[PDB]
Design a binder for this molecule. Structure first.
Ligand SMILES: [Ca+2]
Lengths: 124, 98
């Protein structure tokens, strides 16, 4: 995130970090067993890290759960990034608690001009 | 875990959904119906490498997934996001059967 601000710790409780030794992508928790992410973030093995704020320091609210299934959209196009969406099944259900929580799927598309919140551990 | 370039602390950004016309004008020939642009045509504020897969949440609803862009925070090159309101049935049916 370039030009952003530091989120208040655990104020984005649906945000997860995808880790294969180190952080490489984000994701969103949509029920206790499933994270939605981007298909170009695919790796054969992924550890999902929930409840994170500082991804380098153990703070006490983390849950580290390895993926059991990783399902990319069948019509993903790796050249154009069309259909860039992926679902990750956790090998055990996350424990949902004030710092680890789900985000709702949309009931309709957002109108142009709608203000949104974007978050991540990407380059600043 | 943050390695050499990523921040340690989770970062946040408020940004507006942009019109479909502005999105296609910024990225001629590259925008499908499964993509939305979110951000600032003036540049300066954007998602970037390491953010892919993460959320764009509007009025409490997941509307975008960080996907791609030309550079980061460049003028007339806002972030391009997977359009989540195209995929609720794919998401629900995949979860229901797996
Ligand atoms: Ca931590």
């Amino acid at each position: 995130i370039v030009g952003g601000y530091t989120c208040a710790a655990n104020s984005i409780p649906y945000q997860v970090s995808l880790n294969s030794g180190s952080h490489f992508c984000g994701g969103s928790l949509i029920n206790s067993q499933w994270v939605v992410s981007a298909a170009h973030c695919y790796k054969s093995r992924i550890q999902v890290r929930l409840g994170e704020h500082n991804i380098d320091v153990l703070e006490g609210n983390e849950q580290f759960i390895n993926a059991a299934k990783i399902i990319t959209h069948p019509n993903f196009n790796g050249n154009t990034l069309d259909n860039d969406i992926m679902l990750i099944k956790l090998s055990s259900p996350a424990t949902l608690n004030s710092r680890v929580a789900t985000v709702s799927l949309p009931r309709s598309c957002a109108a142009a001009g709608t203000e949104c919140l974007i978050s991540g551990w990407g380059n600043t | 875990s943050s390695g050499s370039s990523y921040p340690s602390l989770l970062q946040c950004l408020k940004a507006p959904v942009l019109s479909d016309s502005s999105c296609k004008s910024s990225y001629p020939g590259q925008i499908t119906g499964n993509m939305i642009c979110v951000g600032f045509l003036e540049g300066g504020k954007d998602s970037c490498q390491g953010d892919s897969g993460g959320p764009v949440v509007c009025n409490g609803q997941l509307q975008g997934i960080v996907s791609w862009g030309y550079g980061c925070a460049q003028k007339n090159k806002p972030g391009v996001y997977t359009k989540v309101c195209n995929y609720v049935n794919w998401i629900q049916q995949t979860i229901a059967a797996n």
